[PDB]
Design a protein around this nucleic acid. Sequence first.
RNA 1: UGUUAGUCUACGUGGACCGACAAAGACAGAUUCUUUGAGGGAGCUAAGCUCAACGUAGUUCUAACAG
Length: 850
Amino acid sequence: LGEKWKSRLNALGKSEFQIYKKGIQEVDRTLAKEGIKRGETDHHAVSRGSAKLRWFVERNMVTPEGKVVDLGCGRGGWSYYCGGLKNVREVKGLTKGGPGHEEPIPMSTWNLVRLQSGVDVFFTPPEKCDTLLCDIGESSPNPTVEAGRTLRVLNLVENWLNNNTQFCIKVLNPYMPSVIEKMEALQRKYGGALVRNPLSRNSTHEMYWVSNASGNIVSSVNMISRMLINRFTMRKATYEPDVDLGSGTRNIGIESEIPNLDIIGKRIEKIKQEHETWYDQDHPYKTWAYHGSYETKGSASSMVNGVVRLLTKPWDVVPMVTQMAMTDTTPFGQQRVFKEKVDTRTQEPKEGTKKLMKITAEWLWKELGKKKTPRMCTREEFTRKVRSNAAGNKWKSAREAVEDSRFWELVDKERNLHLEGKCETCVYNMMGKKGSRAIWYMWLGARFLEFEALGFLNEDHWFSRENSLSGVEGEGLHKLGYILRDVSKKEGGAMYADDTAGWDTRITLEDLKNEEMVTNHMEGEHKKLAEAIFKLTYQNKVVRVQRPTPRGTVMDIISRRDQRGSGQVGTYGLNTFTNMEAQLIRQMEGEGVFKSIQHLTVTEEIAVQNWLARVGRERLSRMAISGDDCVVKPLDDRFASALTALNDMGKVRKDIQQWEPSRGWNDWTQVPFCSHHFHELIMKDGRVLVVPCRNQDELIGRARISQGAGWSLRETACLGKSYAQMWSLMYFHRRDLRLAANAICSAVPSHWVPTSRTTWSIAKHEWMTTEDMLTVWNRVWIQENPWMEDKTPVESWEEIPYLGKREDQWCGSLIGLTSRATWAKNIQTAINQVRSLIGNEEYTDYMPSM
RNA sequence: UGUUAGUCUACGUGGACCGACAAAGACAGAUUCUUUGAGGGAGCUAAGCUCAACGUAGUUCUAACAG
Ligand SMILES: [Zn+2]
Ligand SMILES: [Zn+2]
């Protein structure tokens, strides 16, 4: 049956073979090449078997625990993937080695992994193991030779397997009579079946002999044979996300967090009372202790931005914009992200680092407390802060809960209980977002007390540059660019920009003990509620998360005593404060103060305190920090190599191996702050300006994403208009971008007031106004620059310049190609066609077409 | 051992510009820039060099792979 398939498989041309191997679900390998070349020894792997193992493991087709015997590691994919699992006691690897064979490259993804390279698996006498993995195999343009290889491997491992032994063998010759007969003999005694992994590539008929099943392989063989017969004359190229693998050495000390019961007993009783009609043994958690589950009824739905899409004809064929705009729906993505990043444990710091963080937070709160004071907020402000598109366990909306009138009856008892530092309902709910970071919601009744406790941060502006000197609040995009323009004038060296990976999951237990110091200045019932919320909730998080197994979609509860401790709204300021602290400690390591981070003494503590109290404002002025992002201008060139105190805290940086040298910029035009780089432009009026910029394909694609739940066309047109307005008021230095903005504004009717969402990191969102764009441009980009003394109004758009061709093509463009020429020539046709497609109202001209 | 895109090491073919000449991109319109030929081949020739456009033969390497 399969001999014709094998004969025609080697009868294909080599070029067509390479084209045909990659339409299936192939995981991305673009970053794997960088990881090999740049020398990253952790994070995303390179072996194609790792994706197959990930697919098989999460559905419990295999149960890898106890003793592990591997038969060939390739580059180390199977060995290192299972080296970090919770219950894998020992990892033993024997690579065939020698010339002509695939050889593993040492990595640091391994404490219990022992590799003896250069030894065939046939040199080893028959030994029994808990779970065995088989990968080694060579395909040749003769089926008999690979059949003999399969026969010899099966004959060797025949004495190795038993009923108790788990196994994952990748069968390379599953369609020959003798191997099939032997497999049938084995499956009638031990169990396991031949299944094709959809993540396996179509290089050949590679099957997997699974152990968590006992069905007959006949149907699977027939189905896969038919599918691969009809795949030759098929009537695609998609990438799946690369599975995170973490880094470091596994330890048995911090494994799992003990769930304290005297705080969550009533909460779990309340959770159980919801169904009572409620455990499971298919949970993959190793750091989240399960306590209950209940049967319940995919990922975030992506909506295309049609208005932007129609007018971006030159970018209709670029794959990046399309893939960022097209629908991406999978029924496993949420739990995929959950297991790859949130389920991972965090290495805890040591006494020296935690003490340094403790004293740094004390100094910082000493400094900011002398110019501000927390205030007891009021009820009316809570509804006033209902901005953004989320404006929504009965009900789910904020507006409805106010008029439900049960809200006060619920919150009264909680307010009374929070007086004495006791609580009963402070639960969370997390779901949705491909992103790789966690988003936290909160109960709206709990949201009310969270607001009444810590809502002063978003209004009193503790983190404004007046009291922060490094924050983003109180400083617009133009003002941030101006500050970056003055940082260069300030004496110093290189400008360093970094983006730490997994910031939310890397926040340790000690860090949450720094925010409690805000209770120092509070008083009365506000202080009592602050202490109660800081103790009862900020150190004990209950999360209800889904698991859609073939047995059903079950929501289960899990308790963790680490990571972020707030919702989606207050997280910004707290994260910014922690990031200022982290930048301060990293600079302290760079300059050189402490000679040992394992241990400390009073003298170093008081010296650090004096240094902080002396030059804290000066050091804060030099750094520009927004959320998890931070750009730094230190006073030394040795700032790059000081990473020991940085990774002692437990921060992991992506795009590079953790212990490799840092990356910085001596050019301030390409320093990414707030995920954007600033260009300087010279205009005819004798004054200088600054503008944001990035990969224009990224900007267009972000303009091509529509968010939310439920949608229409008017809001899409408003999105297009708002994107165009923001482009004109911020990115006016570009040709393609400004052309698109003036054509979308010329297409969407201007009688519709723009009130929509652009991003999440937007002060002074000027691009939601129906005013004349020239007027607002005049007011924001001439009047609002205190360095300018000659205010020269412009009554036409011929004055506003662009950048030269070199920088335009450097930051990504289409000038110098016939596509840009066609788009510029056909601006009339595109404008008219989108005007006809959207609607016809009285338009407002903002630029001449030519 | 190949498939597929590049590349350090060699030298030669061949060069650093002239405009109210012509044509095509950059639509902020400049001393406009860039690009190709017709006429000068900058009295008039040319290796060496700073670079690399072109080529022939690597005992030069990696890269989805391949065997
Ligand atoms: Zn509570
Ligand atoms: Zn740019």
